[PDB]
């Protein structure tokens, strides 16, 4: 009686992450359609993530006041309608699209901060962990499907607008299900508590470095997932061979496959490395960061040579980078005591979104514009400028790796502090 609800929620999350990244797979066309610089292309994702991080704590609090199913159904319909309306914006008005992206961010934040609570309430066993794994495995599949949907729809209909039309309709078919087949589960000072928790977590050392590391990871993931298809299209343009829907299709498929493989390999490496030292969880993550960096820079030296080498680097870097997702949560839960775990998770997500994904696309676009304005205008210069701008990603990756190394250094001391405080 509850499995149908879990399946519907998983499909809704697939739709959520498909609609989130649909803009990126057609981003180039948007930049061509509105005739704007790369600053606006960065602004789309930046405003989306900023609205998401602003709205996330509010919906997290609100989900304990009213009916969660009602809020979820309202949010899904809201974001679907906003996307559908944005799919008809005139060319002259650009900022209205950014406002629509912000509204989409609010709507998706509602779903992302509500649905996991419903799933946790539905089941209480290892089956709950299995359901959560199924739900959260919808992230890479949804991102890959979003890239594929945007590229294929642009290829087949000859217009990018249709992409922003495909996702919302399914959401409608999803939304009704949420109002119908999802059961209602009757399951169940704050400011001062939050302030005390923040004061206590500031004094914590490994938590801050883990937050910085995951902020760097979010920065890298957002910037790359936003700008890589455009960079590859520009490289194909400058390449002697003349062509880019297939490029986005390949990137999306590689993204999904690498997400699955990287999550599995990271989990397995953590399992196999726990038997040798207690600092396995951070260090492995650190290795992954390094494992990404040496490969990420590789594409910036191999993009001008051939596309196959670029895609190989994308595959390896995506795997090694996505390896940290499962381990970061364990790193967090190992240090913070259960009393403050919810506040720690909320603040870590807030900081990771703020210092990371919020500014990465806009910063990359700003760097690209600054480099391009001082140089001659030519497609080769566009591609080279975008490469030099994306060169800031591996530096942040290495900084995050060093932060993970520091977390590994302070891991045992912070664990001892946590256990002493719990037993005190």
């Amino acid at each position: 009686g509850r499995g149908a609800a879990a399946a519907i929620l998983s499909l809704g999350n697939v739709l959520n992450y498909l609609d989130r990244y649909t803009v990126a797979g057609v981003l180039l066309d948007i930049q061509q359609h509105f005739g704007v610089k790369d600053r606006g292309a960065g602004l789309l994702q930046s405003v989306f993530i900023c609205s998401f991080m602003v709205a996330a704590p509010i919906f997290g609090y609100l989900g304990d006041r009213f009916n969660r199913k009602v809020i979820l159904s309202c949010g899904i319909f809201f974001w679907s309608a906003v996307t559908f309306s944005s799919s008809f914006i005139p060319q002259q008005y650009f900022w209205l699209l950014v406002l629509s992206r912000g509204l989409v961010g609010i709507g998706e934040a509602s779903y992302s901060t509500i649905a996991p609570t419903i799933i946790g309430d539905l089941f209480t066993k290892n089956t709950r962990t299995l359901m959560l794994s199924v739900f959260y495995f919808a992230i890479p599949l949804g991102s890959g499907l979003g890239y594929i949907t945007g590229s294929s729809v642009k290829q087949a209909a000859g217009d990018w607008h249709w992409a922003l039309r495909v996702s919302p309709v399914l959401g409608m078919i999803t939304g009704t299900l949420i109002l119908i087949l999802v059961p209602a589960t009757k399951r169940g000072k704050a400011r001062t508590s939050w302030l005390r928790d923040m004061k206590a977590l500031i004094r914590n050392r490994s938590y801050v470095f883990s937050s910085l590391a995951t902020s760097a990871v979010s920065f890298a993931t957002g910037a790359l997932g936003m700008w890589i298809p455009l960079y590859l299209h520009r490289a194909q343009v400058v390449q002697k061979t003349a062509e880019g829907a297939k490029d986005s299709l390949i990137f999306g498929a590689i993204t999904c496959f690498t997400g699955f493989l990287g999550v599995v390999t990271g989990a397995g490496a953590t399992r196999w490395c726990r038997l040798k030292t207690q600092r396995a969880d951070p260090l492995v993550c650190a290795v992954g960061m390094l494992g990404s960096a040496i490969f990420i820079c590789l594409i910036f030296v191999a993009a001008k040579s051939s596309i196959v080498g670029a895609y190989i680097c994308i595959f390896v870097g995506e795997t090694l980078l996505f390896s940290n997702w499962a381990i970061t949560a364990d790193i967090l839960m190992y240090v913070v005591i259960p009393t403050r775990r919810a506040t720690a998770v909320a603040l870590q997500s807030f900081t990771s979104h703020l210092l990371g994904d919020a500014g990465s696309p806009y910063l990359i676009g700003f760097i690209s514009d600054l480099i391009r304005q001082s140089t001659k205008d030519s497609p080769l210069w566009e591609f080279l400028s975008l490469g030099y701008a994306l060169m800031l990603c591996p530096f942040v990756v290495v900084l995050g790796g060093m932060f993970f190394l520091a977390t590994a250094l302070f891991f045992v001391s912070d664990r001892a502090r946590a256990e002493q405080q719990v037993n005190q």
């Epitope: 726990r274 040798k276 005591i337 045992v412 664990r415 502090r417 256990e419 002493q420 037993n423």
Partner: nanobody, 126 residues
Framework: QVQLVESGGGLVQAGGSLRLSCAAS????????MAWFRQAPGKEREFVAA????????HYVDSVKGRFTISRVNAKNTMYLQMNSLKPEDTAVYYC?????????????????????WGKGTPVTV
Amino acid sequence: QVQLVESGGGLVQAGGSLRLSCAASGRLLSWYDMAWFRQAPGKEREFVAAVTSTGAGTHYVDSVKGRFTISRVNAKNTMYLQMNSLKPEDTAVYYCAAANTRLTALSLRTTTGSWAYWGKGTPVTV
């Protein structure tokens, strides 16, 4: 796949000093909260002392405070328990127990059901 070996148990003089050692070899010991239990001939398993993963949190029984000291060396994966001024009620079979590390109040987990790993158990006579 963790197996515990007890040592240092046996007949001792009344009120003498004794040391009990628990060794874990199957897997790394820095991932397990350990504890000692005593089975009495006329009673069931009784909690004695417990230590967390690092060693910064230790819990005892109100009838044993100030007499027994429990410590651990995670480098050699060996837990030690020094018992001094042995009362005659201390004669029992001591079992070393290990559980996966959890950030719970060690004073709350005395139920002989939370510890899924057990040792052979050595007898001590006062």
